[PDB]
Amino acid sequence: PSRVRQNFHPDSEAAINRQINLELYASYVYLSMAYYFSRDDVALNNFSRYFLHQSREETEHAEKLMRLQNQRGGRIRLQDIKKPEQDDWESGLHAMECALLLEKNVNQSLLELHALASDKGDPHLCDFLETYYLNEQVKSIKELGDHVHNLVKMGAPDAGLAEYLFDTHTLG
Amino acid sequence: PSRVRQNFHPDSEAAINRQINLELYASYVYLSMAYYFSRDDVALNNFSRYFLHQSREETEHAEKLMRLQNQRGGRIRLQDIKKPEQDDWESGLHAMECALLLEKNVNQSLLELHALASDKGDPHLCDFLETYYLNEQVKSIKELGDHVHNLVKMGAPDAGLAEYLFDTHTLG
Amino acid sequence: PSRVRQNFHPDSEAAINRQINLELYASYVYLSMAYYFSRDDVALNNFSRYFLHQSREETEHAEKLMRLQNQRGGRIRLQDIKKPEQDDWESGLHAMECALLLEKNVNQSLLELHALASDKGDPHLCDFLETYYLNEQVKSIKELGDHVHNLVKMGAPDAGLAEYLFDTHTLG
Amino acid sequence: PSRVRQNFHPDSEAAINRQINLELYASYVYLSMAYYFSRDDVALNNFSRYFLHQSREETEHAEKLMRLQNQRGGRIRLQDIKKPEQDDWESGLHAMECALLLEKNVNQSLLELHALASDKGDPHLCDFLETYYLNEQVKSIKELGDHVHNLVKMGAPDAGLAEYLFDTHTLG
Ligand SMILES: [Cl-]
Ligand SMILES: [Cl-]
Ligand SMILES: [Cl-]
Ligand SMILES: [Cl-]
Ligand SMILES: [Cl-]
Ligand SMILES: [Cl-]
Ligand SMILES: [Cl-]
Ligand SMILES: [Cl-]
Ligand SMILES: [Cl-]
Ligand SMILES: [Cl-]
Ligand SMILES: [Cl-]
Ligand SMILES: [Cl-]
Ligand SMILES: [Cl-]
Ligand SMILES: [Cl-]
Ligand SMILES: [Cl-]
Ligand SMILES: [Cl-]
Ligand SMILES: [Cl-]
Ligand SMILES: [Cl-]
Ligand SMILES: [Cl-]
Ligand SMILES: [Cl-]
Ligand SMILES: [Cl-]
Ligand SMILES: [Cl-]
Ligand SMILES: [Cl-]
Ligand SMILES: [Cl-]
Ligand SMILES: [Fe+2]
Ligand SMILES: [Fe+2]
Ligand SMILES: [Fe+2]
Ligand SMILES: [Fe+2]
Ligand SMILES: [Fe+2]
Ligand SMILES: [Fe+2]
Ligand SMILES: [Fe+2]
Ligand SMILES: [Fe+2]
Ligand SMILES: [Fe+2]
Ligand SMILES: [Fe+2]
Ligand SMILES: [Fe+2]
Ligand SMILES: [Fe+2]
Ligand SMILES: [Fe+2]
Ligand SMILES: [Fe+2]
Ligand SMILES: [Fe+2]
Ligand SMILES: [Fe+2]
Ligand SMILES: [Fe+2]
Ligand SMILES: [Fe+2]
Ligand SMILES: [Fe+2]
Ligand SMILES: [Fe+2]
Ligand SMILES: [Fe+2]
Ligand SMILES: [Fe+2]
Ligand SMILES: [Fe+2]
Ligand SMILES: [Fe+2]
Ligand SMILES: [Fe+2]
Ligand SMILES: [Fe+2]
Ligand SMILES: [Fe+2]
Ligand SMILES: [Fe+2]
Ligand SMILES: [Mg+2]
Ligand SMILES: [Mg+2]
Ligand SMILES: [Mg+2]
Ligand SMILES: [Mg+2]
Ligand SMILES: [Mg+2]
Ligand SMILES: [Mg+2]
Ligand SMILES: [Mg+2]
Ligand SMILES: [Mg+2]
Ligand SMILES: [Mg+2]
Ligand SMILES: [Mg+2]
Ligand SMILES: [Mg+2]
Ligand SMILES: [Mg+2]
C-alpha cells in the first residue's frame, strides 16, 4: 500500500471515488442550467449567474475529495461525467426545483458515506464530511427551498412578472 | 488613383459608401426612438437613454467606415439620410422589435460587404469588418432579443407595470 | 427559429456542440493529470499546479463556445464527458507528451470547424475561432513542445533529478 | 472530584496523560534531528530548520492536551521523556523515513484515544481530537511521504547532489 495509508478502508476509498463523480455531475447540471438562463428566449441573467456560481462550487467539492483521496493514500479513479437529464430547464422555478432535488440526492450520498466511514472506524473521514460537506448541503438545500417558496408564491412560471422580479431583486 | 490606393476594388469603395449611409440611417432611427420615449405621454427615461446611446454608437460605426475609405484612398460619397419609418414608435416593446429588425438588416448588409471583400481578395477589408462590425452586430442582436423576450413575457405593452418595471430594472 | 438567428448553419451549430464536449474532455484530462502529480509517490507540486491551470483554461474554452451558441441563437446540447484514457500518468514527461497530443487533436478539431464555417460563409464564426482559439492552440502546443524537449534532454523520466529540477525551475 | 468535571471518564484522563508524554517524546525526536542536520559533517540547514519547526509544533500539541486536561478537571501526570532512538540520524532521507514512522505511530495512538472517547460517550473529547489532531496528522504524514518519495527518486542518500538540492529547493 501507499507509505502514507493508515486506517483507510478500501470501501471508503471506492465510496470517495463515487462521490467525486457525483460532485462533478452536480457541477455539470448547474453549468447546463447557467447557460439555459442566458438563452435569448429566457434571458434571466441573475439566474444564470446564480447557477454558474453553484457549478463552480460543485467543482470545488469534487476537488476537495480528490485531495482527500491523495492525502489518505487512496487512488483517484475517474469515470464518465454523465450529461444532465435536460438541456431545456423550462423555467426559473423548474430549475430551482431540480436543483433542490439534486442537492437532496447529493446529501443522501454524503450521509451514506458518513455511515460507511463510521462503520469503518474512520473518524478523520467522518470529520472531513461534517466539516466541509454536511452543513454546506443543509445551507444549500435551505436556500433552494427559500427560493422555490418565493417563486411559487409569486406565481412563477406563468405569472409574467414573477421570474423577472425574482431575478432582479433576490438573485441580483 | 490616390497615391495610397492598393488592392482596393471600386466595387468595395462603392459598397463602403452605401454602408456609411446605412449606419447613419440606423443612427437616425435610434435618435427618433430616444426622443419618442421622452414624450410626456410615454416618459420611459431609461428606454430614452438606451436608444440615445445606440444612436451615438451607430454614428461611431459610420465614422469608422468614413475613416476606412480615407485610409484606403477611396472617396467618401454621402447621400441623403432617409427619415425613419415612424415618429410614433407605439411602445417600448415595439421599438425593441423594430431595433432588432434594423440590426438584422444592417448585419445582412455587412455580411454582403464581407462576401464582396472576399470575392475581391481584400483581406484588410475582411479583417476590418470582422474586427469592428460582425461581432458587435451579433452582440447587439442578442441583447435586443433578450430585451424583446423579457418584455413579451412581462406582458408588454398592455400590462400596465411591464414597460415601467423593465425601464427601471433592466435599462436603469 | 430563434429571433436572433442569422447566417448560422445547423451544421455549424452541431459542430459547436461537439467542440464544447471536446473542450470539457480536455479540461477533465488536465484535472486528472493535476491530481496525479499530487500523489504521495509522485509529489511534483508545480506539475500539479501547471495542469490544474490548464484544466481551468479548457473549461473557459468550453464556456466561450457555450456563450457563442447562445449569442448566435443555437441550442446547447451537452453530452457525457468521457473519462481520461489513464488515471496513472506515469511521469512528468509522459503527461507532457499526452498533453501535447491532446492539444494537437483539439487543434485539428478547431481547424475542421473553421473549414466548415468557411464553407458555410460564416465570417463571424471564422473570426471567433481565429480570435480566441487558433493562436491559443499554437501557443499551447509550442509551450508543451518546449517542455517535452527540456524534459527529454534532462533525462526524464529515469534520471532521478530531471523531473524534480524541471518542476522547481521551469514550472515554479 | 473537580467542581468542573463532567462526563470525563478516568480512563480518558489517563489516556490523555499518555498522549501528552508521546507528543513531548515526538518533540524531542525532532529536536534531536534538527541538531543532527547542523553538524559540521552534515550541514543541511533547511533540514535542520524543518525538523526544529516540527519539534516546536509537537510541544504545541502536548500543551493543548495539557490545557484540555485542566479544562475538563483531570489532573496532569507527567512522566520521563525518553531519549530518541538515535543521535546520529544517518541522512536526510533516513530522518524523513523515521519521522514518517513516528507520525504514523502518534496517529495510531490518537485513533485509539478517539475510539476510547467514543466508547465512553465523550463527544467533547472526540471533537477535540478531530478538530486539532487527526487532520493535522494526516497532513503531516502526507507531507513526509511526499518528501520521502522525492528524496528516494533523486537518489538520496548516496547521490551526492540529492540531499543538497532537496534542502535548497524544497525545504528552503
Ligand atoms: Cl489502511
Ligand atoms: Cl466510466
Ligand atoms: Cl459511467
Ligand atoms: Cl470512528
Ligand atoms: Cl428566497
Ligand atoms: Cl411553497
Ligand atoms: Cl487599387
Ligand atoms: Cl441622395
Ligand atoms: Cl437618396
Ligand atoms: Cl482575401
Ligand atoms: Cl433583457
Ligand atoms: Cl419570447
Ligand atoms: Cl440562420
Ligand atoms: Cl452522451
Ligand atoms: Cl457520449
Ligand atoms: Cl465567410
Ligand atoms: Cl520549457
Ligand atoms: Cl527533443
Ligand atoms: Cl466525570
Ligand atoms: Cl516516569
Ligand atoms: Cl517512564
Ligand atoms: Cl459520543
Ligand atoms: Cl516533497
Ligand atoms: Cl517512492
Ligand atoms: Fe452555493
Ligand atoms: Fe460561493
Ligand atoms: Fe456538492
Ligand atoms: Fe446516457
Ligand atoms: Fe450541492
Ligand atoms: Fe462524531
Ligand atoms: Fe467537528
Ligand atoms: Fe452549496
Ligand atoms: Fe449598443
Ligand atoms: Fe456603448
Ligand atoms: Fe451599426
Ligand atoms: Fe421619403
Ligand atoms: Fe446597430
Ligand atoms: Fe450595437
Ligand atoms: Fe424594484
Ligand atoms: Fe495554457
Ligand atoms: Fe492562463
Ligand atoms: Fe481548449
Ligand atoms: Fe468508456
Ligand atoms: Fe488546450
Ligand atoms: Fe492553452
Ligand atoms: Fe536551483
Ligand atoms: Fe508540521
Ligand atoms: Fe507550523
Ligand atoms: Fe503531535
Ligand atoms: Fe532508556
Ligand atoms: Fe507529529
Ligand atoms: Fe504536523
Ligand atoms: Mg519504505
Ligand atoms: Mg454515481
Ligand atoms: Mg450572463
Ligand atoms: Mg507621385
Ligand atoms: Mg442604402
Ligand atoms: Mg431623458
Ligand atoms: Mg416576433
Ligand atoms: Mg467528440
Ligand atoms: Mg498542490
Ligand atoms: Mg462547592
Ligand atoms: Mg507512551
Ligand atoms: Mg541552522
PDB file of N, CA and C in Angstrom, chain A residues 2-4 20-21 24 28 31-32 34-41 52 56 59 63-64 66-67 70-71 73-84 87-88, chain C residues 2-4 20-21 24 28 31-32 34-41 52 56 59 63-64 66-67 70 73-84 87-88:
ATOM      1  N   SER A   2       0.238   2.416  -0.241  1.00  0.00           N
ATOM      2  CA  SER A   2       0.880   3.718  -0.132  1.00  0.00           C
ATOM      3  C   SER A   2       1.586   3.864   1.217  1.00  0.00           C
ATOM      4  N   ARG A   3       2.831   4.394   1.241  1.00  0.00           N
ATOM      5  CA  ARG A   3       3.503   4.633   2.522  1.00  0.00           C
ATOM      6  C   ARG A   3       2.757   5.572   3.473  1.00  0.00           C
ATOM      7  N   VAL A   4       1.742   6.282   2.976  1.00  0.00           N
ATOM      8  CA  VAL A   4       1.000   7.189   3.828  1.00  0.00           C
ATOM      9  C   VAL A   4      -0.253   6.512   4.389  1.00  0.00           C
ATOM     10  N   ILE A  20     -16.746  11.724  -5.778  1.00  0.00           N
ATOM     11  CA  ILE A  20     -16.120  12.661  -6.722  1.00  0.00           C
ATOM     12  C   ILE A  20     -16.947  12.738  -8.001  1.00  0.00           C
ATOM     13  N   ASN A  21     -17.348  11.579  -8.531  1.00  0.00           N
ATOM     14  CA  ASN A  21     -18.110  11.588  -9.778  1.00  0.00           C
ATOM     15  C   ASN A  21     -19.437  12.342  -9.598  1.00  0.00           C
ATOM     16  N   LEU A  24     -18.911  16.110  -9.576  1.00  0.00           N
ATOM     17  CA  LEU A  24     -18.652  16.596 -10.932  1.00  0.00           C
ATOM     18  C   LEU A  24     -19.942  16.605 -11.753  1.00  0.00           C
ATOM     19  N   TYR A  28     -21.885  19.772 -13.510  1.00  0.00           N
ATOM     20  CA  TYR A  28     -22.298  19.795 -14.914  1.00  0.00           C
ATOM     21  C   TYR A  28     -23.772  20.197 -15.058  1.00  0.00           C
ATOM     22  N   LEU A  31     -23.919  23.871 -14.612  1.00  0.00           N
ATOM     23  CA  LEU A  31     -23.371  24.565 -15.783  1.00  0.00           C
ATOM     24  C   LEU A  31     -24.430  24.617 -16.883  1.00  0.00           C
ATOM     25  N   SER A  32     -25.139  23.493 -17.081  1.00  0.00           N
ATOM     26  CA  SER A  32     -26.208  23.418 -18.067  1.00  0.00           C
ATOM     27  C   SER A  32     -27.280  24.458 -17.729  1.00  0.00           C
ATOM     28  N   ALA A  34     -26.967  27.196 -15.956  1.00  0.00           N
ATOM     29  CA  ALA A  34     -26.484  28.566 -16.101  1.00  0.00           C
ATOM     30  C   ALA A  34     -26.681  29.034 -17.539  1.00  0.00           C
ATOM     31  N   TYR A  35     -26.335  28.186 -18.512  1.00  0.00           N
ATOM     32  CA  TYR A  35     -26.378  28.614 -19.908  1.00  0.00           C
ATOM     33  C   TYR A  35     -27.792  28.558 -20.483  1.00  0.00           C
ATOM     34  N   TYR A  36     -28.692  27.783 -19.872  1.00  0.00           N
ATOM     35  CA  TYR A  36     -30.094  27.861 -20.246  1.00  0.00           C
ATOM     36  C   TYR A  36     -30.623  29.285 -19.999  1.00  0.00           C
ATOM     37  N   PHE A  37     -30.262  29.871 -18.838  1.00  0.00           N
ATOM     38  CA  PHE A  37     -30.809  31.166 -18.474  1.00  0.00           C
ATOM     39  C   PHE A  37     -30.244  32.313 -19.300  1.00  0.00           C
ATOM     40  N   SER A  38     -29.181  32.068 -20.073  1.00  0.00           N
ATOM     41  CA  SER A  38     -28.669  33.101 -20.962  1.00  0.00           C
ATOM     42  C   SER A  38     -29.139  32.912 -22.408  1.00  0.00           C
ATOM     43  N   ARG A  39     -30.066  31.972 -22.666  1.00  0.00           N
ATOM     44  CA  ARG A  39     -30.699  31.897 -23.978  1.00  0.00           C
ATOM     45  C   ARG A  39     -31.457  33.194 -24.265  1.00  0.00           C
ATOM     46  N   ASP A  40     -31.525  33.564 -25.550  1.00  0.00           N
ATOM     47  CA  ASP A  40     -32.223  34.798 -25.915  1.00  0.00           C
ATOM     48  C   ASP A  40     -33.714  34.747 -25.569  1.00  0.00           C
ATOM     49  N   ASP A  41     -34.290  33.538 -25.470  1.00  0.00           N
ATOM     50  CA  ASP A  41     -35.706  33.362 -25.161  1.00  0.00           C
ATOM     51  C   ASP A  41     -35.937  33.008 -23.690  1.00  0.00           C
ATOM     52  N   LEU A  52     -24.216  29.404 -12.329  1.00  0.00           N
ATOM     53  CA  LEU A  52     -22.800  29.314 -12.683  1.00  0.00           C
ATOM     54  C   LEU A  52     -21.959  29.245 -11.413  1.00  0.00           C
ATOM     55  N   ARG A  56     -19.433  26.153 -10.077  1.00  0.00           N
ATOM     56  CA  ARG A  56     -18.051  26.289  -9.659  1.00  0.00           C
ATOM     57  C   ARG A  56     -17.858  25.752  -8.245  1.00  0.00           C
ATOM     58  N   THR A  59     -17.521  21.950  -8.438  1.00  0.00           N
ATOM     59  CA  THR A  59     -16.188  21.527  -8.864  1.00  0.00           C
ATOM     60  C   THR A  59     -15.216  21.623  -7.681  1.00  0.00           C
ATOM     61  N   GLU A  63     -12.967  18.576  -6.106  1.00  0.00           N
ATOM     62  CA  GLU A  63     -11.524  18.698  -5.907  1.00  0.00           C
ATOM     63  C   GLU A  63     -11.107  18.425  -4.465  1.00  0.00           C
ATOM     64  N   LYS A  64     -11.909  18.839  -3.472  1.00  0.00           N
ATOM     65  CA  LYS A  64     -11.522  18.613  -2.089  1.00  0.00           C
ATOM     66  C   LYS A  64     -11.520  17.113  -1.788  1.00  0.00           C
ATOM     67  N   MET A  66     -10.887  14.810  -4.157  1.00  0.00           N
ATOM     68  CA  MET A  66      -9.718  14.302  -4.853  1.00  0.00           C
ATOM     69  C   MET A  66      -8.462  14.505  -3.997  1.00  0.00           C
ATOM     70  N   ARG A  67      -8.367  15.680  -3.350  1.00  0.00           N
ATOM     71  CA  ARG A  67      -7.261  15.959  -2.444  1.00  0.00           C
ATOM     72  C   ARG A  67      -7.285  14.983  -1.266  1.00  0.00           C
ATOM     73  N   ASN A  70      -5.828  11.627  -2.189  1.00  0.00           N
ATOM     74  CA  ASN A  70      -4.363  11.666  -2.190  1.00  0.00           C
ATOM     75  C   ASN A  70      -3.800  11.756  -0.774  1.00  0.00           C
ATOM     76  N   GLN A  71      -4.400  12.605   0.061  1.00  0.00           N
ATOM     77  CA  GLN A  71      -3.884  12.785   1.407  1.00  0.00           C
ATOM     78  C   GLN A  71      -3.880  11.463   2.162  1.00  0.00           C
ATOM     79  N   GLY A  73      -3.775   8.436   0.804  1.00  0.00           N
ATOM     80  CA  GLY A  73      -3.068   7.354   0.120  1.00  0.00           C
ATOM     81  C   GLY A  73      -3.954   6.465  -0.759  1.00  0.00           C
ATOM     82  N   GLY A  74      -5.204   6.877  -0.978  1.00  0.00           N
ATOM     83  CA  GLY A  74      -6.063   6.198  -1.940  1.00  0.00           C
ATOM     84  C   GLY A  74      -5.705   6.647  -3.354  1.00  0.00           C
ATOM     85  N   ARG A  75      -6.307   5.980  -4.340  1.00  0.00           N
ATOM     86  CA  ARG A  75      -6.028   6.311  -5.728  1.00  0.00           C
ATOM     87  C   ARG A  75      -7.318   6.739  -6.422  1.00  0.00           C
ATOM     88  N   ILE A  76      -7.277   7.962  -6.948  1.00  0.00           N
ATOM     89  CA  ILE A  76      -8.398   8.540  -7.681  1.00  0.00           C
ATOM     90  C   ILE A  76      -8.677   7.687  -8.922  1.00  0.00           C
ATOM     91  N   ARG A  77      -9.946   7.341  -9.100  1.00  0.00           N
ATOM     92  CA  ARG A  77     -10.394   6.614 -10.274  1.00  0.00           C
ATOM     93  C   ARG A  77     -11.580   7.394 -10.830  1.00  0.00           C
ATOM     94  N   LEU A  78     -11.339   8.077 -11.948  1.00  0.00           N
ATOM     95  CA  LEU A  78     -12.378   8.913 -12.543  1.00  0.00           C
ATOM     96  C   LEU A  78     -13.260   8.083 -13.475  1.00  0.00           C
ATOM     97  N   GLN A  79     -14.510   8.517 -13.604  1.00  0.00           N
ATOM     98  CA  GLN A  79     -15.462   7.887 -14.519  1.00  0.00           C
ATOM     99  C   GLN A  79     -16.096   8.954 -15.406  1.00  0.00           C
ATOM    100  N   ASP A  80     -16.819   8.521 -16.441  1.00  0.00           N
ATOM    101  CA  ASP A  80     -17.516   9.486 -17.280  1.00  0.00           C
ATOM    102  C   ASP A  80     -18.403  10.383 -16.411  1.00  0.00           C
ATOM    103  N   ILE A  81     -18.480  11.665 -16.788  1.00  0.00           N
ATOM    104  CA  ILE A  81     -19.452  12.575 -16.177  1.00  0.00           C
ATOM    105  C   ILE A  81     -20.705  12.568 -17.043  1.00  0.00           C
ATOM    106  N   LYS A  82     -21.790  11.978 -16.527  1.00  0.00           N
ATOM    107  CA  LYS A  82     -22.985  11.859 -17.345  1.00  0.00           C
ATOM    108  C   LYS A  82     -23.587  13.230 -17.635  1.00  0.00           C
ATOM    109  N   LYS A  83     -24.160  13.371 -18.836  1.00  0.00           N
ATOM    110  CA  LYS A  83     -24.842  14.615 -19.160  1.00  0.00           C
ATOM    111  C   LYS A  83     -26.057  14.810 -18.252  1.00  0.00           C
ATOM    112  N   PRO A  84     -26.480  16.074 -18.028  1.00  0.00           N
ATOM    113  CA  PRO A  84     -27.692  16.338 -17.242  1.00  0.00           C
ATOM    114  C   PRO A  84     -28.929  15.736 -17.913  1.00  0.00           C
ATOM    115  N   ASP A  87     -31.518  19.655 -21.321  1.00  0.00           N
ATOM    116  CA  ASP A  87     -30.822  20.875 -21.727  1.00  0.00           C
ATOM    117  C   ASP A  87     -31.739  22.090 -21.550  1.00  0.00           C
ATOM    118  N   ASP A  88     -33.037  21.879 -21.803  1.00  0.00           N
ATOM    119  CA  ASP A  88     -34.094  22.870 -21.651  1.00  0.00           C
ATOM    120  C   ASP A  88     -34.693  22.685 -20.260  1.00  0.00           C
TER     121      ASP A  88
ATOM    122  N   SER C   2     -34.870  30.787 -33.558  1.00  0.00           N
ATOM    123  CA  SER C   2     -34.599  31.857 -32.609  1.00  0.00           C
ATOM    124  C   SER C   2     -34.722  33.225 -33.283  1.00  0.00           C
ATOM    125  N   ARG C   3     -35.384  34.208 -32.632  1.00  0.00           N
ATOM    126  CA  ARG C   3     -35.446  35.556 -33.206  1.00  0.00           C
ATOM    127  C   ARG C   3     -34.085  36.215 -33.443  1.00  0.00           C
ATOM    128  N   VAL C   4     -33.014  35.650 -32.881  1.00  0.00           N
ATOM    129  CA  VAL C   4     -31.700  36.230 -33.071  1.00  0.00           C
ATOM    130  C   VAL C   4     -30.966  35.558 -34.234  1.00  0.00           C
ATOM    131  N   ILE C  20     -17.713  21.928 -27.821  1.00  0.00           N
ATOM    132  CA  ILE C  20     -17.907  22.114 -26.376  1.00  0.00           C
ATOM    133  C   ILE C  20     -17.544  20.831 -25.635  1.00  0.00           C
ATOM    134  N   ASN C  21     -18.028  19.690 -26.130  1.00  0.00           N
ATOM    135  CA  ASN C  21     -17.746  18.433 -25.440  1.00  0.00           C
ATOM    136  C   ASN C  21     -16.235  18.160 -25.406  1.00  0.00           C
ATOM    137  N   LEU C  24     -14.486  20.302 -22.792  1.00  0.00           N
ATOM    138  CA  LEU C  24     -14.756  19.787 -21.449  1.00  0.00           C
ATOM    139  C   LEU C  24     -13.954  18.510 -21.193  1.00  0.00           C
ATOM    140  N   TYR C  28     -11.076  17.772 -18.353  1.00  0.00           N
ATOM    141  CA  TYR C  28     -11.098  16.618 -17.453  1.00  0.00           C
ATOM    142  C   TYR C  28      -9.756  15.874 -17.461  1.00  0.00           C
ATOM    143  N   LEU C  31      -7.428  17.867 -15.381  1.00  0.00           N
ATOM    144  CA  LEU C  31      -7.757  17.741 -13.956  1.00  0.00           C
ATOM    145  C   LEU C  31      -7.182  16.432 -13.416  1.00  0.00           C
ATOM    146  N   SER C  32      -7.322  15.352 -14.201  1.00  0.00           N
ATOM    147  CA  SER C  32      -6.781  14.051 -13.829  1.00  0.00           C
ATOM    148  C   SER C  32      -5.265  14.167 -13.652  1.00  0.00           C
ATOM    149  N   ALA C  34      -3.493  16.847 -13.008  1.00  0.00           N
ATOM    150  CA  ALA C  34      -3.124  17.691 -11.876  1.00  0.00           C
ATOM    151  C   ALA C  34      -3.069  16.853 -10.603  1.00  0.00           C
ATOM    152  N   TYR C  35      -4.071  15.995 -10.391  1.00  0.00           N
ATOM    153  CA  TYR C  35      -4.150  15.254  -9.134  1.00  0.00           C
ATOM    154  C   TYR C  35      -3.225  14.038  -9.127  1.00  0.00           C
ATOM    155  N   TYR C  36      -2.810  13.553 -10.300  1.00  0.00           N
ATOM    156  CA  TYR C  36      -1.767  12.542 -10.342  1.00  0.00           C
ATOM    157  C   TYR C  36      -0.478  13.094  -9.708  1.00  0.00           C
ATOM    158  N   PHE C  37      -0.128  14.353 -10.046  1.00  0.00           N
ATOM    159  CA  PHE C  37       1.131  14.908  -9.584  1.00  0.00           C
ATOM    160  C   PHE C  37       1.135  15.241  -8.099  1.00  0.00           C
ATOM    161  N   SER C  38      -0.030  15.217  -7.446  1.00  0.00           N
ATOM    162  CA  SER C  38      -0.066  15.422  -6.004  1.00  0.00           C
ATOM    163  C   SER C  38      -0.177  14.105  -5.230  1.00  0.00           C
ATOM    164  N   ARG C  39      -0.056  12.948  -5.907  1.00  0.00           N
ATOM    165  CA  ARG C  39       0.060  11.682  -5.194  1.00  0.00           C
ATOM    166  C   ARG C  39       1.319  11.687  -4.325  1.00  0.00           C
ATOM    167  N   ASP C  40       1.256  10.976  -3.193  1.00  0.00           N
ATOM    168  CA  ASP C  40       2.413  10.935  -2.296  1.00  0.00           C
ATOM    169  C   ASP C  40       3.635  10.287  -2.953  1.00  0.00           C
ATOM    170  N   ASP C  41       3.419   9.437  -3.971  1.00  0.00           N
ATOM    171  CA  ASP C  41       4.502   8.747  -4.665  1.00  0.00           C
ATOM    172  C   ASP C  41       4.854   9.417  -5.996  1.00  0.00           C
ATOM    173  N   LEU C  52      -3.453  21.891 -13.401  1.00  0.00           N
ATOM    174  CA  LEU C  52      -4.699  22.423 -12.851  1.00  0.00           C
ATOM    175  C   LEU C  52      -5.071  23.710 -13.577  1.00  0.00           C
ATOM    176  N   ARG C  56      -8.468  24.539 -15.922  1.00  0.00           N
ATOM    177  CA  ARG C  56      -9.361  25.673 -15.774  1.00  0.00           C
ATOM    178  C   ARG C  56      -9.459  26.458 -17.077  1.00  0.00           C
ATOM    179  N   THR C  59     -11.943  24.680 -19.372  1.00  0.00           N
ATOM    180  CA  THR C  59     -13.333  24.954 -19.013  1.00  0.00           C
ATOM    181  C   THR C  59     -13.735  26.340 -19.536  1.00  0.00           C
ATOM    182  N   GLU C  63     -16.829  27.191 -22.090  1.00  0.00           N
ATOM    183  CA  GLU C  63     -17.835  28.207 -21.781  1.00  0.00           C
ATOM    184  C   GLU C  63     -17.949  29.267 -22.872  1.00  0.00           C
ATOM    185  N   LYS C  64     -16.833  29.667 -23.501  1.00  0.00           N
ATOM    186  CA  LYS C  64     -16.912  30.695 -24.527  1.00  0.00           C
ATOM    187  C   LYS C  64     -17.693  30.168 -25.733  1.00  0.00           C
ATOM    188  N   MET C  66     -20.107  27.845 -25.426  1.00  0.00           N
ATOM    189  CA  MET C  66     -21.487  27.806 -24.974  1.00  0.00           C
ATOM    190  C   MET C  66     -22.132  29.188 -25.123  1.00  0.00           C
ATOM    191  N   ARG C  67     -21.370  30.241 -24.777  1.00  0.00           N
ATOM    192  CA  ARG C  67     -21.843  31.607 -24.949  1.00  0.00           C
ATOM    193  C   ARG C  67     -22.081  31.901 -26.432  1.00  0.00           C
ATOM    194  N   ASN C  70     -25.371  30.496 -27.632  1.00  0.00           N
ATOM    195  CA  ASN C  70     -26.492  31.351 -27.232  1.00  0.00           C
ATOM    196  C   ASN C  70     -26.518  32.654 -28.027  1.00  0.00           C
ATOM    197  N   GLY C  73     -28.033  32.104 -31.330  1.00  0.00           N
ATOM    198  CA  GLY C  73     -29.377  31.530 -31.385  1.00  0.00           C
ATOM    199  C   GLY C  73     -29.418  30.011 -31.581  1.00  0.00           C
ATOM    200  N   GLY C  74     -28.263  29.351 -31.472  1.00  0.00           N
ATOM    201  CA  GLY C  74     -28.227  27.895 -31.462  1.00  0.00           C
ATOM    202  C   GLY C  74     -28.610  27.380 -30.077  1.00  0.00           C
ATOM    203  N   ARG C  75     -28.772  26.060 -29.977  1.00  0.00           N
ATOM    204  CA  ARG C  75     -29.154  25.461 -28.709  1.00  0.00           C
ATOM    205  C   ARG C  75     -28.081  24.471 -28.266  1.00  0.00           C
ATOM    206  N   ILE C  76     -27.547  24.740 -27.075  1.00  0.00           N
ATOM    207  CA  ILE C  76     -26.530  23.894 -26.461  1.00  0.00           C
ATOM    208  C   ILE C  76     -27.116  22.500 -26.223  1.00  0.00           C
ATOM    209  N   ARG C  77     -26.369  21.488 -26.650  1.00  0.00           N
ATOM    210  CA  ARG C  77     -26.734  20.102 -26.418  1.00  0.00           C
ATOM    211  C   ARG C  77     -25.504  19.435 -25.812  1.00  0.00           C
ATOM    212  N   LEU C  78     -25.587  19.163 -24.511  1.00  0.00           N
ATOM    213  CA  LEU C  78     -24.451  18.580 -23.802  1.00  0.00           C
ATOM    214  C   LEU C  78     -24.475  17.058 -23.920  1.00  0.00           C
ATOM    215  N   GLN C  79     -23.285  16.468 -23.860  1.00  0.00           N
ATOM    216  CA  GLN C  79     -23.135  15.013 -23.875  1.00  0.00           C
ATOM    217  C   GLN C  79     -22.257  14.580 -22.705  1.00  0.00           C
ATOM    218  N   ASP C  80     -22.204  13.272 -22.447  1.00  0.00           N
ATOM    219  CA  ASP C  80     -21.323  12.786 -21.394  1.00  0.00           C
ATOM    220  C   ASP C  80     -19.897  13.289 -21.639  1.00  0.00           C
ATOM    221  N   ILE C  81     -19.200  13.617 -20.543  1.00  0.00           N
ATOM    222  CA  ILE C  81     -17.766  13.908 -20.619  1.00  0.00           C
ATOM    223  C   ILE C  81     -17.014  12.614 -20.333  1.00  0.00           C
ATOM    224  N   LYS C  82     -16.372  12.050 -21.364  1.00  0.00           N
ATOM    225  CA  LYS C  82     -15.717  10.768 -21.171  1.00  0.00           C
ATOM    226  C   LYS C  82     -14.538  10.897 -20.212  1.00  0.00           C
ATOM    227  N   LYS C  83     -14.316   9.843 -19.418  1.00  0.00           N
ATOM    228  CA  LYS C  83     -13.156   9.841 -18.540  1.00  0.00           C
ATOM    229  C   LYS C  83     -11.865   9.842 -19.360  1.00  0.00           C
ATOM    230  N   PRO C  84     -10.756  10.362 -18.789  1.00  0.00           N
ATOM    231  CA  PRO C  84      -9.460  10.318 -19.477  1.00  0.00           C
ATOM    232  C   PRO C  84      -9.009   8.875 -19.718  1.00  0.00           C
ATOM    233  N   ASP C  87      -5.619   7.038 -15.381  1.00  0.00           N
ATOM    234  CA  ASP C  87      -5.568   7.759 -14.109  1.00  0.00           C
ATOM    235  C   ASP C  87      -4.113   7.941 -13.664  1.00  0.00           C
ATOM    236  N   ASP C  88      -3.286   6.929 -13.956  1.00  0.00           N
ATOM    237  CA  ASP C  88      -1.856   6.907 -13.676  1.00  0.00           C
ATOM    238  C   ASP C  88      -1.140   7.396 -14.931  1.00  0.00           C
TER     239      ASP C  88
END
